[PDB]
Amino acid sequence: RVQLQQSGPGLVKPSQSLSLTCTVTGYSITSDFAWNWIRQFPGNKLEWMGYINYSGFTSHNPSLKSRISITRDTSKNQFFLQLNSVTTEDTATYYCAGLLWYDGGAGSWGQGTLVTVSAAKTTAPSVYPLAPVCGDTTGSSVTLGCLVKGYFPEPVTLTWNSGSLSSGVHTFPAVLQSDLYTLSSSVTVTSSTWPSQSITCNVAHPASSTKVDKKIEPRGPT
Amino acid sequence: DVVMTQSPKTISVTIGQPASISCKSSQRLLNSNGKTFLNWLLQRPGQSPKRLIYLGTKLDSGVPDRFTGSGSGTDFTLKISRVEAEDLGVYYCWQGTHFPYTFGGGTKLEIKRADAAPTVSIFPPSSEQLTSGGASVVCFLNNFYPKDINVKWKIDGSERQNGVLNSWTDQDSKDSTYSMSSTLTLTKDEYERHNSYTCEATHKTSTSPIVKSFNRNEC
């Protein structure tokens, strides 16, 4: 039905501004809805930031006092968030959400966009293959992996065989150390299918425009 | 501002059993037109919050009717008639009656299931990383229940704790298990200094740690 999608720079320097766009499809932004911005802190606490409704009237949380501007472009069916004077306390996942003005119904939220407030530099990751040791390949199933190391900021996307391999996958939350993240992912398959059917880790880091497609090679002759 | 208090903080429930959670607001949420702007939302792991209940008692658009909202004034309750594994996640209440609009702190629904030992897997550093001069040893502890687990690393039989970084998944709806990754990071020169590397997992399904090891420069 109505669908919302957030876009905007995912890394902002301290004391500058975050600027986000929500693009609405399947409904006109000049009808029926309040178009909200909501953010979720790393703790998982949610905070209501503000709205602009279908006639252009706005409201925002006094918690943000003076820093927030919410606007729209009806010709593009988009509404926007600007938040100035940011600090690391504004690092959060930012969501756009439409709720019907009349009754608060039909809540529809975008996928959410992470925004990191930091002076640290953008760094592309190294993607390392995790190939199983010989002794652990004689079972009925085998586990392979991928180590994504030393990137900034979040996030990266990781798929297996371009997303055609999705059962038996575990992708772990990234860990931050010294302004770089490391993430890993495991995939488990029937051992007799490997290495006859190859397995490739597909990693993308949109912040550095970098992609790595790493085929996992067995230890031993290849 | 209105404070929304949810209880309990966490709930663990067997599939097919019912679930009830509550939200208490510091102010009445009825408005001057008879409407109560009280919503319930579910956030599944890795997803954005999604609608369940609105107007205090009404099923939101498209939601399974296993969810029931009741209450009025300041005391509200969300009920799930029979819990399914895909119902796991964090449940939030939200009020839109008093400015500024506020959310409850959330209630995490966990699925109770049969105990399960981890599948443990250990991985040496890759050739490519070693040319970098850094060396990460990775151990996965996959699909175990319950969630509490301990990982111990040894190097040439001796426990090692510096350089270890751990990461846990949320509960998995497909099988109600947990998984964990542990990574031991060394300089290439220290890694190239020793021979055996060992990942030890301690979980309630066993009295004996699950142990996985390898020798450097052996397949």
From Swiss-Prot, chain A:
Domain Ig-like: 125-217
Annotated localization: Cell membrane
Cystine connections: C146-C201
Annotated protein name in UniProt: Immunoglobulin heavy constant gamma 2A
Entire-sequence positions represented here: 1 to 102 of 398
